[PDB]
Curated annotation (Swiss-Prot):
This is Protein DOA1. Disulfide bonds: none annotated. It is found in: Nucleus; Cytoplasm; Mitochondrion outer membrane; Endosome membrane. Belongs to the WD repeat PLAP family. Disruption phenotype: Severely reduces cell growth in response to misfolded protein, translation inhibition-induced, heat or mitochondrial oxidative stresses but not in response to ER stress. Forms a complex composed of CDC48, NPL4, UFD1, DOA1, SHP1 and deubiquitinase OTU1; within the complex interacts with CDC48. Interacts (via PUL domain) with CDC48 (via C-terminus); the interaction is direct. Forms a complex composed of CDC48, DOA1, deubiquitinase UBP3 and probably BRE5; within the complex interacts with CDC48 and UBP3. May form a complex composed of VPS27, HSE1 and DOA1. Interacts with HSE1 (via SH3 domain). Interacts (via WD repeats and PFU domain) with ubiquitin; the interaction is direct. It comes from Saccharomyces cerevisiae (strain ATCC 204508 / S288c) (Baker's yeast). The WD repeats mediate interaction with ubiquitin. The PUL domain is composed of 6 armadillo-like repeats and mediates the interaction with CDC48 C-terminus. Present with 6800 molecules/cell in log phase SD medium. WD repeats lie at residues 12-41, 54-83, 97-125, 135-166, 177-206, 218-247, 259-288.
Length: 296
C-alpha cells in the first residue's frame, strides 16, 4: 500500500454533496441538497455539467450501466433517471412508490434497489416495482442486492437491525451487530457483508451465522458510507471529517484522510481504484494512489 492523494477538486454544487457514483474512469456523478445532479467528465481536467435540476433535496444516486441512466432520489419521494447527455430543465424515467425520502439507491444486474425514510426498501426492474420490502420499524438507510438470481436483498435501518430478504419476505434479522442506527451496507459475497453505523463502527458479518467476524474501529462519530475497493479493501467515511481505508482481511487502518468539511456523506470507487468523495463543503473530490493523477 501507498497512500491516496488528492487528484481533483470538483466545484459546482451549492449545498452538501450527499451521494456520488462512478460512471467510468472518466466520468463521475453527484447529487446534492442544491437539487441538482451533476456529471463530471475528465478530458485533461474535470468539467462538471448539470444534467438535472429540481427543487427537492437529492440524497441518493446510482448508475444503470445498460440503459446509461443516472438514477437519483431524495426528499420528494421519487426516483428519476436521466441520460448522460440530459440538460438541466428537461423533464427526466420515473420510479414511483416511496412515501418518504429516498436515502439510498443501488443498481445491480438490472435491479434497482432503494432505501427510504418511509421505512421500506423497494426493488425495481424494468421501471416497475417488483418487491416492497416492508418490515423495519424505522427509516431504511441502505438497501443492497445480495443475489439477483435468488432475489435476496439486504437492508439496514434506524431500528438498529439489518434484514436479509428473499422476494418480499424477511428470512433473517441481524439484531446483534450494532446497538445504534445502521447506516450502510456492502455485500462482499453471498455469505458475507459489511455494515456501518452511527455507533462509529464497521463490522464484517457472516450472513449465515450472524457472527461478527471483524470490527473496524476508529471513526470518532457516525459512519455514513462504506464501499469495497477493487482489491477488496474497505473505504469508509463519516461525521468525523474522515475518509478511511482499511484492510478487510486483517483490520489494519491503512490511511486516514481528514477533510475541511463537517461531514463526509459519501464515497464510491472507480474501477481503477480511485476514490470519489462527497462532503458537506459542497465539494466532490477524487483521490488516487497513482502519482500521475495527483493534483500536486
Amino acid at each position: 500500500f501507498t497512500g491516496y492523494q488528492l487528484s481533483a477538486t470538483l466545484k459546482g454544487h451549492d449545498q452538501d454533496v450527499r451521494d456520488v457514483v462512478a460512471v467510468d474512469d472518466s466520468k463521475v456523478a453527484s447529487v446534492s441538497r442544491d437539487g441538482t445532479v451533476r456529471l463530471w467528465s475528465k478530458d485533461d481536467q474535470w468539467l462538471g455539467t448539470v444534467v438535472y435540476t429540481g427543487q427537492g433535496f437529492l440524497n441518493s444516486v446510482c448508475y444503470d450501466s445498460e440503459k446509461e441512466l443516472l438514477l437519483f432520489g431524495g426528499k420528494d419521494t421519487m426516483i428519476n433517471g436521466v441520460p448522460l447527455f440530459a440538460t438541466s430543465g428537461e423533464d427526466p424515467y420515473t420510479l414511483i412508490g416511496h412515501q418518504g425520502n429516498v436515502c439510498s439507491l443501488s443498481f445491480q444486474d438490472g435491479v434497482v434497489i432503494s432505501g427510504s425514510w418511509d421505512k421500506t426498501a423497494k426493488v425495481w426492474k424494468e421501471g416497475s416495482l417488483v418487491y416492497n420490502l416492508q418490515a423495519h420499524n424505522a427509516s431504511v438507510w441502505d438497501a443492497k442486492v445480495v443475489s439477483f438470481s435468488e432475489n435476496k436483498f439486504l437492508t439496514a435501518s434506524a431500528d438498529k437491525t439489518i434484514k436479509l430478504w428473499q422476494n418480499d419476505k424477511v428470512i433473517k434479522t441481524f439484531s446483534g451487530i450494532h446497538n445504534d442506527v445502521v447506516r450502510h451496507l456492502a455485500v462482499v459475497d453471498d455469505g458475507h457483508f459489511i455494515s456501518c453505523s452511527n455507533d462509529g463502527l464497521i463490522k464484517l458479518v457472516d450472513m449465515h451465522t450472524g457472527d461478527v467476524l471483524r470490527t473496524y474501529e476508529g471513526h470518532e462519530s457516525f459512519v455514513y458510507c462504506i464501499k469495497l475497493l477493487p482489491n477488496g479493501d474497505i473505504v469508509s467515511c463519516g461525521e468525523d471529517r474522515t475518509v478511511r481505508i482499511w484492510s478487510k482481511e486483517n483490520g489494519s487502518l491503512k490511511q486516514v484522510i481528514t477533510l475541511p468539511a463537517i461531514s463526509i456523506w459519501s464515497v464510491d470507487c472507480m474501477s481503477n481504484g480511485d476514490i470519489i468523495v462527497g462532503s458537506s463543503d459542497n465539494l466532490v473530490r477524487i483521490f488516487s494512489q497513482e502519482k500521475s493523477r495527483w493534483a500536486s
